Structure 1
Amino acid sequence: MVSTLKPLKIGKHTIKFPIFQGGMGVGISWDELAGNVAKEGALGVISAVGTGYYKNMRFVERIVAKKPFEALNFYSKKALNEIFANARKICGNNPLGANILYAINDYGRVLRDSCEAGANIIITGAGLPTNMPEFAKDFSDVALIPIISSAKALKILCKRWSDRYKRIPDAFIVEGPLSGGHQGFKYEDCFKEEFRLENLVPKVVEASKEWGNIPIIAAGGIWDRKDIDTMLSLGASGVQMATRFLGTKECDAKVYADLLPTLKKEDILLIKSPVGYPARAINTGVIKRIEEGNAPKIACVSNCVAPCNRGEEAKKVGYCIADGLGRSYLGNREEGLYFTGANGYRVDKIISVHELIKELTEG
């Protein structure tokens, strides 16, 4: 209950602790996880990706081969609405974010859906989101947060936003190469010292000074309060963490509770992705099936991401990311796709969100 961490302002919103639970798709950070995180005083973040899978396609208009048909159903507005409402049954009006990647042609629709669902913050990476305010202008109080990989991206985004909208971002998350999910770095660059988070944060904070010290949130490989304190000492205003929350009871993808306590370091690796960025995965499920010659068939139903071009890149890399992540949410160990941060092997227990926040914030 006693902490020396200080509340963090993001636009017009305040969070008690300077910690974001990072968004995780598909079906990983929905209502149970994000609601309980926000209940604790950190930023809970609802993933807006693949919401058509929620409660086994509760809210889709059309299904093909047990998949949400095309992007209107893969990014399901009614599912998103119910996820936000169920989160707020837990956390009330405590701030909540919505995470949506940029590499989708329906980006604006899903951003406005997130706002209309009640999001207080929009977080967007996997691209250079130079036009978030275009889609958010009917919702003036929703704070807007790009995820970036470099100080150069901060400068470019601030200039484009300032010139076009007379607005700059409310915060930036800088994500490093030890993160879960996709990496904002080429595979080779993921192992270079120059791209370590401890080296990125000073440069991004220095770049931020020119635009009035927009708060910088450090993400990727942050495990405990020692790492939080390091990142704050380097000029970050807060941290975003996901792998620790991936190992909590309240995670909405229940498979992880059984998978992480077994997970060995040598079974974490970077793979190719139809999104076009390296993804950090667990060497299990669909990955193993591909190597056996038992790969699930690929035929684009959900049309989840623009770089894939309706199956072109999925066929080249060997797997559909929408199908695999949906299968994981629905419980499929044999054919699911599973992501993790580099630190995933350090999960031994599955603990509650409350005990995790206590660990991270006490003192």
Structure 2
Amino acid sequence: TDRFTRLLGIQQPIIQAPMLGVSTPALAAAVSNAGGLGSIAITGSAAEKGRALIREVRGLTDKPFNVNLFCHRPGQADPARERAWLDYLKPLFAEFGAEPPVRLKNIYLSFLEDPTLLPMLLEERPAAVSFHFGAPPRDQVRALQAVGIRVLVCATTPEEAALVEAAGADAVVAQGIEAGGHRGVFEPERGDAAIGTLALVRLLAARGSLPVVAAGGIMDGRGIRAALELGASAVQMGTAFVLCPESSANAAYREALKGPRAARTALTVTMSGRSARGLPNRMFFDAAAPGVPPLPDYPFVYDATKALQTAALARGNHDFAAQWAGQGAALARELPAAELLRTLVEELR
């Protein structure tokens, strides 16, 4: 199908997934120059810094690229809950001769609570703007579209996909249970249908009319071929690009992904406050276990964890790192992004 590639003015139906902390302008430009759609994530950063990152990408590529923003429900501070969480983490900090932070901060501002992001986006005009955890109001999506920007939203169910349609997006990113990183569920408090890529992509393509981008578990040309047979118009690959040299994955992350840990992934809500999939470690614990206090809101939880990670890292310890990977992780390859992009295009045939 030409549906997606024509929609975004690119050659290849391949998006390199925006991965906050792992994607980079070098990674994005590499994929975009190679004919796909490279991406960056700019949540957690001030608008002008977002604006700089976009321009960094432009200085590397003249081809379309994707800019991703978190659109979650703005986190609700709860100092009592947050204090009880910190006290619970106290022995972990003490292990590295450290103390937990005194307070926690809303480190990731939602697109719905930072008014300055939309106007900056309407100025920079990246070819694509994608959202995770929810959809903006239709008039906001329309404003970006009015300026030539394609709008992507991640959905995890047919019900969420309907909301993406109502928001007026140009394409839906259909994220199956296989996907590495944070799950795109809109309202985790209602539960999580946890639908696999194969079913979700088929359900959205066969019973919907929006171009579908399949995300989760896709690691090669056979996977891409399979996604297209299901009716997707393109794929989004995260894990597959992590070992690329252009990525900002650290040493230990690359080692975990290259090694035997890659055979088994798991979901955690205790790392960030929102369900996410990666290589299990000490930050993957049972929040339902005895003596574990109620969980603070996302993203305050991640703030607490990031403080612990820093303390851990200050003693050579990476057992608390966020090493996100999808269920196809064992098929991970290590190539320069543009060479990987083209290997995929070849395997895609």
Q: What's the % identity of the aligned pairs?
A: 22
Q: 1:337 aligns with which of 300, 319, 322?
A: 322
Structure 2 segments unaligned to the other structure (5+ residues)? 73-109, 288-295
Partner of 2:222 in structure 1?
A: 226
Superposed displacement of residue 336, structure 1: 3.4
Q: Which amino acid aligns with 1:15?
A: I
Partner of 1:120 in structure 2?
A: 127
| Contact map agreement 1:7 1:18 (CA 8 A) in 2 | no
Superposed displacement of residue 107, structure 1: 4.8
Q: 2:143 aligns with which of 116, 128, 137?
A: 137
The answer to whether 1:257 aligns with 2:263 is no
Change (3 A) 1:135 1:149: closer
Q: 1:35 aligns with which of 26, 29, 32?
A: 29
Q: 2:158 aligns with which of 128, 151, 169?
A: 151
| Contact map agreement 1:16 1:41 (CA 8 A) in 2 | yes
Change (3 A) 1:353 1:327: farther
| Contact map agreement 2:71 2:131 (CA 8 A) in 1 | yes
The answer to whether 1:170 aligns with 2:170 is yes
Change (3 A) 1:358 1:325: farther
Change (3 A) 1:268 1:158: closer
Q: Determine helix, strand or coil for the equivalent of 2:219.
A: coil
Superposed displacement of residue 183, structure 1: 2.1
Change (3 A) 1:124 1:222: same
| Contact map agreement 2:309 2:318 (CA 8 A) in 1 | no
Partner of 1:245 in structure 2?
A: 241
Change (3 A) 1:107 1:332: farther
Distance 2:22 2:60 in 1: 17
Change (3 A) 1:266 1:176: same
The answer to whether 1:360 aligns with 2:329 is no
Q: 1:320 aligns with which of 304, 310, 313?
A: 304
Partner of 1:19 in structure 2?
A: 14
Structure 1 segments unaligned to the other structure (5+ residues)? 51-74, 162-167, 291-305
Partner of 1:183 in structure 2?
A: 183
Change (3 A) 1:135 1:172: closer
Q: How far does the alpha carbon of each residue in 1:252-298 deviate from its partner, in whole angstroms, 9 at most, with x for none?
A: 2343434321242455321114765321122347559x9xxxxxxxx
Distance 2:172 2:36 in 1: 17
Superposed displacement of residue 245, structure 1: 0.6
Change (3 A) 1:114 1:274: farther
Count residues with an aligned counterpart.
293
Q: Determine helix, strand or coil for the equivalent of 2:339.
A: helix
Distance 1:327 1:81 in 2: 31
Change (3 A) 1:46 1:6: same
Q: How far does the alpha carbon of each residue in 1:26-48 deviate from its partner, in whole angstroms, 9 at most, with x for none?
A: x2112111111111111111111
Q: What TM-score, normalized by structure 2, do the two folds share? A: 0.72
Change (3 A) 1:286 1:114: farther
Distance 2:328 2:123 in 1: 35
Change (3 A) 1:342 1:155: same
Q: Determine helix, strand or coil for the equivalent of 2:214.
A: strand
Change (3 A) 1:319 1:109: closer
Change (3 A) 1:277 1:83: same
Change (3 A) 1:307 1:119: farther
| Contact map agreement 1:324 1:336 (CA 8 A) in 2 | no
Change (3 A) 1:287 1:96: same
RMSD of aligned Cα (Å): 3.4
Q: How far does the alpha carbon of each residue in 1:310-336 deviate from its partner, in whole angstroms, 9 at most, with x for none?
A: 74xx2xxx8735657899999983653
Distance 1:132 1:323 in 2: 37
Superposed displacement of residue 130, structure 1: 4.2
Partner of 2:88 in structure 1?
A: none
Superposed displacement of residue 115, structure 1: 4.1
Q: 1:100 aligns with which of 47, 69, 93?
A: 69
Q: How far does the alpha carbon of each residue in 1:72-100 deviate from its partner, in whole angstroms, 9 at most, with x for none?
A: xxx222322222222222212x1111111
